[PDB]
Amino acid sequence: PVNPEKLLVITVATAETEGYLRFLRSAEFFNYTVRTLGLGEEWRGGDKARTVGGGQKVRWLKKEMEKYADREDMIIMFVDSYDVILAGSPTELLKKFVQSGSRLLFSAESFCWPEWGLAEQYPEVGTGKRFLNSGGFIGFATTIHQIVRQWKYKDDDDDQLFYTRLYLDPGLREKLSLNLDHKSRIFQNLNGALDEVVLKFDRNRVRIRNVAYDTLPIVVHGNGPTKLQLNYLGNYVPNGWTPEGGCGFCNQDRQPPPRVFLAVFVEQPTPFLPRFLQRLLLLDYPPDRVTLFLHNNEVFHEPHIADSWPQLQDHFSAVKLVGPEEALSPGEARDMAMDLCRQDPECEFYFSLDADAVLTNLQTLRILIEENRKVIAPMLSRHGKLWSNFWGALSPDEYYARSEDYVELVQRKRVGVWNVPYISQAYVIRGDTLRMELPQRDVFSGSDTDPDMAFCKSFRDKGIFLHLSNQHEFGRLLATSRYDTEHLHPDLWQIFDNPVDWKEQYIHENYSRALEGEGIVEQPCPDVYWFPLLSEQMCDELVAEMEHYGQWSGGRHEDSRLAGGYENVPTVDIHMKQVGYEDQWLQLLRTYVGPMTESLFPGYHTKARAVMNFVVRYRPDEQPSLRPHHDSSTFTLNVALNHKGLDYEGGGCRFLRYDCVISSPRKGWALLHPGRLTHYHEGLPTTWGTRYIMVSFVDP
Amino acid sequence: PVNPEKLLVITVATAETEGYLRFLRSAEFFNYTVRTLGLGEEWRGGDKARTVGGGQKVRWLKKEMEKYADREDMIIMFVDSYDVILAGSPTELLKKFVQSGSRLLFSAESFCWPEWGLAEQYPEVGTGKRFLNSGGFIGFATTIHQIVRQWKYKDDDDDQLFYTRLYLDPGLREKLSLNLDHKSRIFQNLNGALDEVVLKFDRNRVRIRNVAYDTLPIVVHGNGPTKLQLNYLGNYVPNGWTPEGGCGFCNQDRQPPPRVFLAVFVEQPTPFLPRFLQRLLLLDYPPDRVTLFLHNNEVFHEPHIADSWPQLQDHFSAVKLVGPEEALSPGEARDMAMDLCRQDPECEFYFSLDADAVLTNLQTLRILIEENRKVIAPMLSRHGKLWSNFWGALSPDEYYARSEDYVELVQRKRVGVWNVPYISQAYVIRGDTLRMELPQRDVFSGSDTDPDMAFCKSFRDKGIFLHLSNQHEFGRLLATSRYDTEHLHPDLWQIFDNPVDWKEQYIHENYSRALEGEGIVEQPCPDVYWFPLLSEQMCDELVAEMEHYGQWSGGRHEDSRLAGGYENVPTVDIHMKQVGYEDQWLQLLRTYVGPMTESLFPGYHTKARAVMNFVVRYRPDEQPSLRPHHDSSTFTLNVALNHKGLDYEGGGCRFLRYDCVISSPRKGWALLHPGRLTHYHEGLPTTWGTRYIMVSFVDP
Ligand SMILES: *[C@@H]1O[C@H](CO)[C@@H](O[C@@H]2O[C@H](CO)[C@@H](O)[C@H](O)[C@H]2NC(C)=O)[C@H](O)[C@H]1NC(C)=O
Ligand SMILES: *[C@@H]1O[C@H](CO)[C@@H](O[C@@H]2O[C@H](CO)[C@@H](O)[C@H](O)[C@H]2NC(C)=O)[C@H](O)[C@H]1NC(C)=O
Ligand SMILES: O=c1ccn([C@@H]2O[C@H](COP(=O)(O)OP(=O)(O)O)[C@@H](O)[C@H]2O)c(=O)[nH]1
Ligand SMILES: O=c1ccn([C@@H]2O[C@H](COP(=O)(O)OP(=O)(O)O)[C@@H](O)[C@H]2O)c(=O)[nH]1
Ligand SMILES: *[C@@H]1O[C@H](CO)[C@@H](O)[C@H](O)[C@H]1NC(C)=O
Ligand SMILES: *[C@@H]1O[C@H](CO)[C@@H](O)[C@H](O)[C@H]1NC(C)=O
Ligand SMILES: O=C(O)CCC(=O)C(=O)O
Ligand SMILES: O=C(O)CCC(=O)C(=O)O
Ligand SMILES: [Fe+2]
Ligand SMILES: [Fe+2]
Ligand SMILES: [Fe+2]
Ligand SMILES: [Fe+2]
């Protein structure tokens, strides 16, 4: 039973990169003893991601092994550190080594790298990996010393060719009892084996299983082009995220805060921008510590920015606008904003936020800064859909791909802080990282590749992790896909594409409370109910849209009213059809009036059909009143669109059979009365100003 | 200026017939002096209506004239009396005689009667009547004496041939200055001149005008076959009926009363007979003075008569039934009933009343008896139509014809007591007239002619007037034309043909009062109105008709109710369509429910459309309740058809949104509530007995 106190892990690492630190945490979880060679030095092993190299690893190890040249009592395992995580204990590792009968076991690989023509020389293996991989091997210290002694080559020569050449010596391979871990009992190299590796869960720990060989490896090596697959596994293995404990490295549970450069990007016509700009004033972070940069690409949004700009300038420490007349492409804009932060040593954190990100959590900035990562994004999704501001995986093209755990994360079945290949629309970046690790200006620009992808790739190429937190509800993403800008108030037409935001801007703030009892709804006259439905902004924009159409009814015009004997009872009005708002208004009816009606009239059901939908204008100079009549409806909805007193005098609705009068309508509130038989009614004369109302004859 | 004290009217009359008395009244109106020859004697002048005759007139006149043979100071006018009325004064008559230059003026006639071959011998006249008529002549007494002296012939020879022969003597005609009144200045004979005579009205007097000659005759002679035309004129001329005075011989203003034989005739299936038989008990005339005879030709009416017969037998002095098993034809039945009166000297008046006569005036018998005529009928019309129980005129066929004043009489623009050619369905006849003047048994029978016509003709042939009074509202005539007897209660289906009577039997007696305010209508729940609509008899017959169909609803049956989510809400019921009563029930709705609805819901109009009309049966053993639902109607009508307590326990209607319960329905009363949106409602469980209701979903 070999003693774990005699096992030493040796690894190489010239800097404490996020991968190195991920490795160490996995080593410390199992209580391994880790010696790290090279930590302050310059890497001379060549660009291992483009070419061969790594001989410097062998030189440093050879020098370290001279201490242990005679230590037959010591087992040593050498592993890479930037792309390796440990998944099993020293005890299990040692038992498995001993079972191999080997004196120095190398990991095995599907590819014969870097000289593919050496494959013939290798021994035959039935089903396991055939070839040697230098990223991981374990053996007696005396045997390892005898191998690494023979290093006498350049720092930029290939370490794995060196070991392969020695392994392919039949006399040497037998003298020293050298072996390869063909069936991945100990070492799992991913390159060429992705289809064989799955996560194996436990209550408080995760590891990996090779389903081809039915093994539980100890060492997971994301060798070659599998770093992102290793990134994926390292979110779980060994104690990343677990069924019972959750995430293991996040906070879980949440005097001057760091100065922040906040950069906002308006790169396409985007709905509800006035609302977004107003949210900036509400972000819970001291505004004297925030510098605002706003890039607007859209002349459509210039009035919006202008209205908001005085309040922003008074709010934040400093503000800078870059408008459309500057002709910047989105890539150049984002380079410029990031570089303003990079070049200012007082910029401790850089926070990029696009205009289609709705931050519902006003503490997002604090939360992300406290997470203490180089780069981190809050998870934002489109309402009720899977689409989000991150990708879990990449295609070989390096385009979008759905990771095996994407849906669980978007649905927040698994919450934590995830290492992912792509983030967008909102993220926070350390100022130090921009200065020390990505000093180039051309981060988003440079190739014909999309800027958002180029940015992520820029960070991946430096080995910087991209973190994504779904630990909290942070907000959502607006649909901007087909946003029709040819209206006086385009956001009035957003009831389909952005219904959550549409409701919050146009439905009365006390509507939902009214629909749940609470004694808001009123019944001023028998079977006439009165409730808040439309927000003041909705009334104002709707009136303005009607006046902008300008073509009100006149003589010869006919409505669906019933008075006396086949009389015609018209109003000066505009029907929703004429302005192109029928479909939107029916959606309102379906969603907000239908349910209100069934609640106030128990027993009644409706799908809210209405062929007659129109806005009425009363004035002393044209048609000031509406004579007694019935409506061609099962029930009628009558919504006040302006203020009695401020905008008009007189007016109001009278119900003759009940000698009951609605003398003082409320802007945004609706009347709901039966349309036939019982509620013969009259619109009293408007005596001054202009009185606007919205009328729907539903279920005719 | 000849003195009217020297003018004597001589006429012949063997009896004081109604025509003679009509003549005398017209003579007394103008203050003529009338000598009447022959009053107690036997007429030997032959049948003047079949043949020639009348010589007896000349014999009596010749004897009377011997007194005046030398009285050159006297003017004498001889006229017939049974078919003559005077229309002008003695003064006007005398002036006109004098203007003629004649010493003995005869009336003229279009026909050369009785020897047509004497026409050549007459003098030529341009346009006036050419030939002599003996019914009227005026002249100096000495001249008349010289003419009548020459009478030496049989009582049955023709008087007019005698005068013609003397007139056609050229020497005589010139010696005595004999003349004919060619242009009807004085005498108007109607035969051959009907087209020339019209009535000329004045405030308090009527006369006739000859429009061919533009004259105003003094003497109107209905000679030959024009007696009925004279009958017509004599209703006005000279003071019969006048614009300002009205009728001149009627009462205008209305201790043992005469014994009466009342005879009732049921000669065809007739509607509402139970009601008619019940009316007999209400006739305002002492029942101990009335003998009832009832002839029923219809087995359909045997149960009706049987139900009523105990009350009739207890009511009247004596009663006799003659049923269908006696095989009597209507003619034999009416002969038999009239002859029972004829042969009983205690039968002072005979009153014949058919079963389709509705006497609304319970004093009809008194009124007609007080009118003191031989034969008189009260005017009865079919509701809102011109058809009545009399004819004003006869065709040459002696069939129906419309008199020039028929419509004015039916519409009661002219009221009085009229001499008319035909009466039917109700009339009163003096017992004496039957004994003394129509002793034959075969009054209605004898020829293949209709009995009703034969009866009138029988009386006309004896010169008996047929009187018709429209001086009062007496009643109406039922339509019996197409009476469908193939029902359990045929009168339920009479809403079209006899709507006045249908209303009085089936509509609630307090319906009309309720429709005119008076605080009968109730509103037991908000916008649920409650009013009396159906009579108890209507409910009882309607239920019984449904149970007699017997085929009530069951499983798989679907109604037009709306509950929850596309649930099916059935009732065990029968729809009006199935029993063949839809059209009738819609008529009820149109006529009685429509107007009630518009009165209780001011502003609403309806033509009372209803596709769903049905009777519901609730029982503990089948379907006792009706779960909460809405109706496919603008408003719903809900009529109770039996008695809570007597016939069922439990039941009632509940309106959930109003926490209001109709716990105690009223048989025959209707509920009226809106059908949609507001009045979600439930039929409570019937716990004992059977609860029937009538339901209509109107305006769906
Ligand atoms: C929604 O409901 C709230 C609470 O019922 C309303 O609040 C009040 O507003 C009045 C006048 O604006 C104030 O005098 C009260 O002090 C407020 N009460 C509270 C608890 O805030 C609010 O006005 C309603 N909103 C709308 C648009 O009608
Ligand atoms: C129609 O209305 C009359 C009067 O309102 C009702 O008459 C009364 O009936 C009750 C019970 O039958 C008696 O106690 C009263 O004395 C009656 N009053 C009078 C003035 O007659 C009559 O019942 C109503 N008819 C129906 C069928 O409901
Ligand atoms: O600048 C560098 C590059 C690499 N390494 C170490 O050398 C190993 C070899 O690099 P890599 O794992 O990327 O090569 P591959 O396994 O993909 O062939 C890394 O894991 C680190 O342990 C290092 O210390 N500094
Ligand atoms: O039974 C009779 C029939 C006739 N007359 C008288 O004789 C007249 C002649 O009869 P009528 O007028 O019917 O004959 P016509 O004028 O039609 O030829 C009558 O008007 C009566 O004045 C009479 O007294 N008794
Ligand atoms: C690691 O060592 C500590 C004692 O030094 C011990 O308490 C802990 O449980 C060990 N953990 C594992 C996973 O072996
Ligand atoms: C008839 O005579 C009386 C007097 O005897 C007279 O009062 C009356 O007015 C006269 N009527 C007519 C119509 O001549
Ligand atoms: O002006 C009002 O409030 C009543 C008008 C009405 O109900 C209608 O549009 O038909
Ligand atoms: O039984 C009742 O009174 C209620 C039933 C009803 O209204 C219906 O027939 O639809
Ligand atoms: Fe309109
Ligand atoms: Fe209306
Ligand atoms: Fe039914
Ligand atoms: Fe119902």
Ligand SMILES: [Mn+2]
């Ligand atoms: Mn590696």
Ligand SMILES: [Mn+2]
């Ligand atoms: Mn005559």
